[PDB]
Amino acid sequence: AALAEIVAQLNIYQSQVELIQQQMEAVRATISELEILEKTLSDIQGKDGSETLVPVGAGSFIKAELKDTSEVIMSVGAGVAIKKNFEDAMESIKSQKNELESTLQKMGENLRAITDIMMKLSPQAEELLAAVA
C-alpha cells in the first residue's frame, strides 16, 4: 500500500543524484580548461619573437610571432578584461581552481547524504514488496 510512496521518492533522489553528478563534471571540465591555460602561459614565458601556429578551424593553422609573452589579457566579468603579468595571472588561476576544487568538495558531500538516505529506504521498499506478494 505505502510501497508506491517509497518507490516514488527514490526517484526524486535518483533524479537529483544524476543532476549533481552532471554539475560536478562541468566543474571538472572548467578545472581542466584552467589547467591547460596554465600550461600555455608557462610554455610561452621567455618566448617573445618565437613563432607559433594558431588553429583556425578544420585542421588549418596560420603563423604568428609571440609578443609580450609575460602579459595576458584576462576576462573579469561584466564585459571587462584586464591585462595582467605572468605571476598575477597564474595567481588568479590557482585561486579559481582552488575555489572550484572547494566547490567540488562540497558537491561531493551533498551527493553522499542523498546516496546514504536512499540506502535506508530500500530495505523498507523491499520488505513491503514481499508483503504485497
Binding site: 573579469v76 566579468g77 564585459g79 571587462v80 578584461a81 584586464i82 591585462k83 595582467k84
Partner: protein, 109 residues
C-alpha cells in the same frame, strides 16, 4: 462575481512570481558588476583594461571604465530597491484580496 476575484488573485500571484525572478536577475548582475569593480581596483592605476561590446574588444581608460561600471552598479541597486518595494505592495494587495474572498464567499447573510 467571486470567481473574477479568484482569477485576479491568481494573476497577481504570478506577477509576484515574475517580480521574484526579476529580483534574482538584478542581484546576479549586481554581483557580477561588483566582482569586476573589485578586480579593477586591485589593478594598478595604469593597468591596461578593455571592454568587450559584441564581437569587438576595445582598450579604454581605466578611470572612465571604472566610472561606467560604478553608474551601472548604482542604477542596478536602485532598481533592486524599487523591485522590493513593488514586491511588498503586491504581497499586501495579495493578503488583502484574499480577505475580500475569504468572506465574499459567505455570500449574503
Amino acid at each position: 462575481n467571486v470567481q473574477h476575484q479568484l482569477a485576479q488573485f491568481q494573476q497577481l500571484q504570478q506577477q509576484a512570481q515574475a517580480i521574484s525572478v526579476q529580483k534574482q536577475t538584478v542581484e546576479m548582475q549586481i554581483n557580477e558588476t561588483q566582482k569586476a569593480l573589485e578586480e579593477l581596483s586591485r589593478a594598478a592605476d595604469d593597468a591596461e583594461v578593455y571592454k568587450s561590446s559584441g564581437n569587438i574588444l576595445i582598450r579604454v581608460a581605466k578611470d572612465e571604465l571604472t566610472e561606467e561600471l560604478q553608474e551601472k552598479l548604482e542604477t542596478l541597486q536602485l532598481r533592486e530597491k524599487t523591485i522590493e518595494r513593488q514586491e511588498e505592495r503586491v504581497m499586501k494587495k495579495l493578503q488583502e484580496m484574499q480577505v475580500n474572498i475569504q468572506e465574499a464567499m459567505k455570500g449574503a447573510g
